[PDB]
């Protein structure tokens, strides 16, 4: 699979950066969240502990998928802003 970054935006008010990307992968299944997170943290030199993948979405007859993710500069700020369910879904915290 090939990852291409489309846009990176800075949000000083929240204290995070927002990343939009495309994944090109003909003849392969939709990439897993772990693989995408690893590739992203390798590509942009990010701490994996404060990186959340909002979504990965496939389309009808396309060979590529679209993804959106967020990166926080502080762990406490991330815990304070993000909803609980998305952190559980991304494996950052453990469900009760």
């Amino acid at each position: 699979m090939e990852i291409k970054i489309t846009e990176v935006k800075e949000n000083k008010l929240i204290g995070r950066k927002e990343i939009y990307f495309e994944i090109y992968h003909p003849g392969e299944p939709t990439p897993s969240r772990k693989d995408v997170k690893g590739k992203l943290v390798a590509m942009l030199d990010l701490n994996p502990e404060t990186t959340v993948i909002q979504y990965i979405r496939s389309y009808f007859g396309s060979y590529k998928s679209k993804g959106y993710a967020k990166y926080y500069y502080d762990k406490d700020r991330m815990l304070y802003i993000e909803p609980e369910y998305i952190l559980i879904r991304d494996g950052i915290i453990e469900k009760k």
Binding site: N11, K12, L13, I14, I81
Partner: protein, 242 residues
């Protein structure tokens, strides 16, 4: 409203001057009473979330507002229902950006980027003027705010004049009269968002409103209601306009 005031607002019944998707959801924010009226203002939440895009959901937008990151006319506003209207200045100091709220060419509210120096002044149209106890003059502006002046200067202010006010201290620094040759900007009606100079004034009996004629840059003439004409300068605008 059988027994009391309404508290809700459907999306399909929202005012037609907003930029909002009317079929995406069922409800919309019912604005709080405040400075402007319903037809010329929008709640702050839509500015934070839909226009600028600093927030994705309403919950995180309220967290931004509660920390005092937004200034409207130089004052911190925390209520997400607060109405923002024509000629207001929205300032984000942490990112160092400023906007002025203006009607579009089709009658919708948009944000016009402005310089930092211009962000300290607000034009106010003198909407009414009355006597108050202690023999003083009270001026009521177009956004509902009020000001006091002594009896000595009663002849320097009349209705439809424009006052340049320094915010947030609310100090007068300039008075622009309404007369022939003054520069005006139209705020409502069919000719909204057009600008020009005054040529003629007409009056009618029995309380019908009065009309003015305006010449634009290219030399075309058009008429509009007097109360829809907003004075912005002597012969050139004192503020940036699109």
């Amino acid at each position: 409203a059988r027994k009391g005031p309404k508290r809700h607002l459907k999306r399909l019944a929202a005012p037609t001057s907003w930029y909002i998707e009317r079929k995406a959801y069922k409800w919309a924010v019912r604005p709080r009473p405040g400075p402007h009226n319903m037809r010329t203002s929008i709640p702050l939440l839509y500015i934070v979330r839909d226009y600028l895009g600093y927030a994705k959901t309403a919950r995180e937008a309220r967290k931004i507002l509660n920390e005092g990151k937004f200034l409207v006319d130089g004052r911190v506003r925390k209520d997400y229902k607060f109405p923002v209207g024509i000629m207001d200045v929205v300032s984000i100091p942490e990112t160092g950006e400023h906007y002025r709220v203006l009607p579009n060419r089709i009658g919708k509210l948009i944000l016009h980027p402005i310089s930092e120096e211009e962000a300290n002044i607000k034009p106010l149209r003198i909407r009414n003027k009355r006597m108050v106890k202690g023999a003083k003059i009270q001026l009521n502006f177009h956004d509902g705010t009020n000001h006091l002046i002594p009896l000595s200067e009663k002849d320097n202010y009349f209705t439809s004049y424009t006052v340049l006010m320094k915010v947030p201290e609310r100090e007068i620094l300039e008075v622009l009269p309404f007369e022939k040759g003054a520069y005006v900007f139209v705020t409502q009606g069919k000719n909204v968002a057009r600008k020009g100079r005054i040529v003629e004034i007409k009056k009618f009996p029995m309380g019908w409103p009065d009309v003015v004629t305006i010449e634009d840059e290219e030399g075309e003439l058009f008429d509009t209601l007097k109360e829809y004409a907003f004075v912005v300068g002597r012969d050139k605008p004192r503020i940036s306009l699109p």
